[PDB]
Amino acid sequence: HGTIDYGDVTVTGGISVFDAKFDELYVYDGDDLGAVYAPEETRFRLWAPTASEAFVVLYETEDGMPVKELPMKRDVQGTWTLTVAEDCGGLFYTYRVKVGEQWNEAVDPYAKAVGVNGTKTAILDLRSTNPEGWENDQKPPLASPTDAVIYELHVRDLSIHPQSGIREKGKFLGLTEEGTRGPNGIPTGLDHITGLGVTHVQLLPIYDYSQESVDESRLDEPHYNWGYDPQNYNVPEGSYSTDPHNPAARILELKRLIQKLHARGLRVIMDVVYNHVYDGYLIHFTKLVPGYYLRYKADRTFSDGTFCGNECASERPIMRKYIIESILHWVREYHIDGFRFDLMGMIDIETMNEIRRRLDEIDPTILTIGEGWMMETVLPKELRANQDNAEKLPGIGMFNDGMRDAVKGDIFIFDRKGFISGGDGFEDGVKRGVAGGINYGGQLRQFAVEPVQSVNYVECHDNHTLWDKIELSTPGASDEERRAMHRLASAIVLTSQGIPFLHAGQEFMRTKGGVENSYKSPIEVNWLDWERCAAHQDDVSYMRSLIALRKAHPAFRLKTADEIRAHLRFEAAPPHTVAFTLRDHAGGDPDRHLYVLYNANPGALSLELPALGPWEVRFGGEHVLALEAARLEVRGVGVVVLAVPR
Ligand SMILES: OC[C@H]1O[C@H](O[C@H]2[C@H](O)[C@@H](O)[C@@H](O[C@H]3[C@H](O)[C@@H](O)[C@@H](O[C@H]4[C@H](O)[C@@H](O)[C@@H](O[C@H]5[C@H](O)[C@@H](O)[C@@H](O)O[C@@H]5CO)O[C@@H]4CO)O[C@@H]3CO)O[C@@H]2CO)[C@H](O)[C@@H](O)[C@@H]1O
Ligand SMILES: OC[C@H]1O[C@H](O[C@H]2[C@H](O)[C@@H](O)[C@@H](O[C@H]3[C@H](O)[C@@H](O)[C@@H](O)O[C@@H]3CO)O[C@@H]2CO)[C@H](O)[C@@H](O)[C@@H]1O
Ligand SMILES: OC[C@H]1O[C@H](O[C@H]2[C@H](O)[C@@H](O)[C@@H](O[C@H]3[C@H](O)[C@@H](O)[C@@H](O)O[C@@H]3CO)O[C@@H]2CO)[C@H](O)[C@@H](O)[C@@H]1O
Ligand SMILES: [Ca+2]
Ligand SMILES: [Ca+2]
Ligand SMILES: [Cl-]
Ligand SMILES: [Cl-]
Ligand SMILES: [Cl-]
Ligand SMILES: [Cl-]
Ligand SMILES: [Cl-]
Numbered sequence: 001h002g003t004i005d006y007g008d009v010t011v012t013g014g015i016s017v018f019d020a021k022f023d024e025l026y027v028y029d030g031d032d033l034g035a036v037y038a039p040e041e042t043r044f045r046l047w048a049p050t051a052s053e054a055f056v057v058l059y060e061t062e063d064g065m066p067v068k069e070l071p072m073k074r075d076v077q078g079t080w081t082l083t084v085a086e087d088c089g090g091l092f093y094t095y096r097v098k099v100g101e102q103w104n105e106a107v108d109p110y111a112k113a114v115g116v117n118g119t120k121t122a123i124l125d126l127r128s129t130n131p132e133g134w135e136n137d138q139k140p141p142l143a144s145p146t147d148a149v150i151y152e153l154h155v156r157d158l159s160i161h162p163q164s165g166i167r168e169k170g171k172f173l174g175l176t177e178e179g180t181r182g183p184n185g186i187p188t189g190l191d192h193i194t195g196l197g198v199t200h201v202q203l204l205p206i207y208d209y210s211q212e213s214v215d216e217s218r219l220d221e222p223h224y225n226w227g228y229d230p231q232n233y234n235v236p237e238g239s240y241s242t243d244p245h246n247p248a249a250r251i252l253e254l255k256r257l258i259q260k261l262h263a264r265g266l267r268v269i270m271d272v273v274y275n276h277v278y279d280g281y282l283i284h285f286t287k288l289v290p291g292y293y294l295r296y297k298a299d300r301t302f303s304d305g306t307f308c309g310n311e312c313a314s315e316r317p318i319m320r321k322y323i324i325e326s327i328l329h330w331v332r333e334y335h336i337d338g339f340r341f342d343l344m345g346m347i348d349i350e351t352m353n354e355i356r357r358r359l360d361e362i363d364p365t366i367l368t369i370g371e372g373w374m375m376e377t378v379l380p381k382e383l384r385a386n387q388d389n390a391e392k393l394p395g396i397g398m399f400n401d402g403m404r405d406a407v408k409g410d411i412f413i414f415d416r417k418g419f420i421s422g423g424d425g426f427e428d429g430v431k432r433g434v435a436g437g438i439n440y441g442g443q444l445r446q447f448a449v450e451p452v453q454s455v456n457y458v459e460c461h462d463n464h465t466l467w468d469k470i471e472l473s474t475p476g477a478s479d480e481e482r483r484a485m486h487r488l489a490s491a492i493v494l495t496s497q498g499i500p501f502l503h504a505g506q507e508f509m510r511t512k513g514g515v516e517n518s519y520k521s522p523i524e525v526n527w528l529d530w531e532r533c534a535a536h537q538d539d540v541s542y543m544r545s546l547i548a549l550r551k552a553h554p555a556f557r558l559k560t561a562d563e564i565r566a567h568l569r570f571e572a573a574p575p576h577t578v579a580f581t582l583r584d585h586a587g588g589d590p591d592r593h594l595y596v597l598y599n600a601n602p603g604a605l606s607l608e609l610p611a612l613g614p615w616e617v618r619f620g621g622e623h624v625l626a627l628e629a630a631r632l633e634v635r636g637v638g639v640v641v642l643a644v645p646r
């Protein structure tokens with residue numbers, strides 16, 4: 001790691017990078033940070049207020065020697081500028097700065113293209129990376145965040161299994177391949193995903209993550225990482241391209257993926273990690289403006305509330321500007337439809353609200369959700385964009401961990417049961433999630449003001465899969481009993497108010513063999529196992545039918561808390577069950593009333609129904625012995641949905 005020199009403070013009039021006054025002096029507001037390319041000329045602008053000198057170093061190859069070093073001119077508000085009056089396309093560059101007594105060299109933080117492993121900025125005309133027809137790219141319609149069904153997927157997981165039937169395994173283009181087949185001829189890849197009826201694919205880190213995680217020059221050797229180690233925020237990851245050495249390839253191929261998903265009726269959500277960088281000492285931010293872009297404690301050490309070594313200082317204006325302009329780059333250049341903010345509680349509220357505001361000016365249907373966990377940091381508590389402050393973050397969804405733990409049990413105490421597995425006293429936790437996490441009434445309240453702020457899930461890339469958690473918490477159960485519990489958990493997600501979220505492979509009871517944190521586990525742990533999918537085609541169809549049920553019934557997708565409080569009623573139900581009605585054509589539902597039973601009791605039950613008319617079975621008939629319209633006879637763990645028709 002070596003030495004960080006925070007600068008000769010005579011350069012900044014005696015004002016240290018750590019002084020609050022620093023943020024009055026050097027707040028550059030221009031829209032031209034980075035390289036602005038033209039065949040006529042390329043203009044460079046670097047923000048580096050503490051540097052006493054700045055150079056652009058030009059390279060001809062991603063690994064070669066400098067062919068030219070050009071001094072930059074000190075400009076306004078801590079920036080440096082340089083105009084090169086030639087066609088610079090095909091060249092590579094870095095910045096070299098003198099900060100204090102030492103010289104540092106770094107990629108452009110505003111890099112839009114890079115060489116292999118992201119060690120040099122690539123000069124490229126981005127118009128030459130657009131797919132044929134990109135100008136006519138249109139998004140599938142979306143009337144409400146509550147109409148989304150999110151499918152969380154890793155680009156490598158999707159296709160790397162040897163029987164995936166996909167040619168470009170591990171690559172962006174692997175998800176553009178249509179008509180791919182797996183074991184016994186089952187659909188795989190894109191056709192499998194569109195066939196489920198999900199609406200959004202949420203992609204694990206597709207920005208450029210560090211060479212320490214996946215070495216893009218050694219892709220012929222085994223490799224795997226989720227990618228939560230950011231290196232270049234504004235350029236795609238090289239290992240998901242067919243040629244990481246061609247700066248244009250990863251850009252064109254990601255746009256091809258997005259174009260194809262849109263044409264097949266899918267939207268794309270990008271997992272973004274603005275809360276930390278791969279290495280606080282080696283990142284370009286620290287080489288160019290040490291002390292500014294990352295958060296420091298009072299003793300001038302890194303704040304490490306991410307447990308990754310560092311936090312980004314989103315609350316400082318130039319970093320706030322950086323994050324916002326990065327998001328807008330992904331929206332405008334790549335047509336991205338949403339963002340999932342990793343450790344959103346490490347980002348400040350003003351930054352999150354300005355992001356939401358800027359996106360609403362472009363397209364309010366663009367999704368913003370995040371991990372709103374309550375986590376310590378030097379960022380003051382009232383500024384953290386987390387669940388405790390959700391009242392201050394309108395329109396931003398947060399993962400509902402209360403609902404998650406109530407349904408499947410404590411994710412950190414592996415053997416602890418929850419609602420689905422026969423634990424005691426989880427019914428109110430499930431009810432709170434059914435109501436969308438809102439202040440429904442009495443003890444049924446969580447953090448959400450509106451149901452658009454609550455993302456419901458029982459599986460994601462983190463922690464055990466739902467199947468693996470059920471296994472660890474039900475040692476006395478058979479796999480057939482656990483499969484019923486698994487199906488019930490998925491049903492709860494898809495019939496609760498709010499935004500439903502599925503982990504890729506949940507539809508076929510994805511297992512990681514009990515691995516809790518698979519971020520760098522081999523592909524054998526992390527792949528979408530298309531053999532298991534072929535053995536679980538009935539479970540896949542069950543998930544497809546659940547998703548179809550939610551789409552057929554807008555009563556499950558109410559947009560406002562007032563509607564939920566006026567139409568959702570919890571009914572009398574015994575322990576280890578939850579029952580509710582959605583009354584009076586809620587949300588424009590075609591049926592007059594719905595009744596939903598979550599039955600975690602494996603035995604036989606006779607239940608009293610509210611006398612609202614001639615109930616009929618709509619879902620889960622396999623659990624129903626009799627319906628008297630009022631009394632319901634059920635047996636076995638699972639969901640039952642009844643309706644009173646119009
Ligand atoms: O269409 C009217 C239908 O609507 C509702 O059914 C829903 C189910 O309650 C729900 O479970 C889901 O059904 C899935 C099923 O869970 C999944 O396993 C798979 O089903 C397989 C069966 O495993 C298999 O035994 C066989 O099913 C037979 C069934 O035994 C027989 O009684 C009769 O109904 O014919 C069926 C086949 O046509 O094959 C199926 C298909 O592989 O896939 C199912 C569909 O995704 O979703 C249903 C709605 O789609 C009502 O609850 C039910 O009463 C009504 O009959
Ligand atoms: O690289 C240093 C860092 O690596 C490891 O941290 C990884 C976590 O173990 C891994 O689970 C993942 O954590 C992220 C979650 O997946 C994400 O959804 C959210 O909760 O934020 C987490 C951080 O962004 O990725 C990280 C980073 O690769 C290792 O465990 C750390 O101790 C180590 O400092
Ligand atoms: O040391 C880094 C850490 O990274 C990962 O931990 C993540 C959890 O796996 C993930 O569930 C989430 O934890 C939050 C809970 O879900 C929530 O209910 C509440 O308890 O807040 C938690 C965060 O404080 O996020 C963490 C942190 O990224 C990885 O899985 C760990 O193994 C690893 O230790
Ligand atoms: Ca990379
Ligand atoms: Ca909104
Ligand atoms: Cl759908
Ligand atoms: Cl690869
Ligand atoms: Cl907090
Ligand atoms: Cl328990
Ligand atoms: Cl809560």
Ligand SMILES: [Cl-]
Pocket residue numbers: 473474475476477
């Ligand atoms: Cl058990």
Ligand SMILES: [Cl-]
Pocket residue numbers: 604635
């Ligand atoms: Cl019976």
Ligand SMILES: [Cl-]
Pocket residue numbers: 592645646
């Ligand atoms: Cl009616």
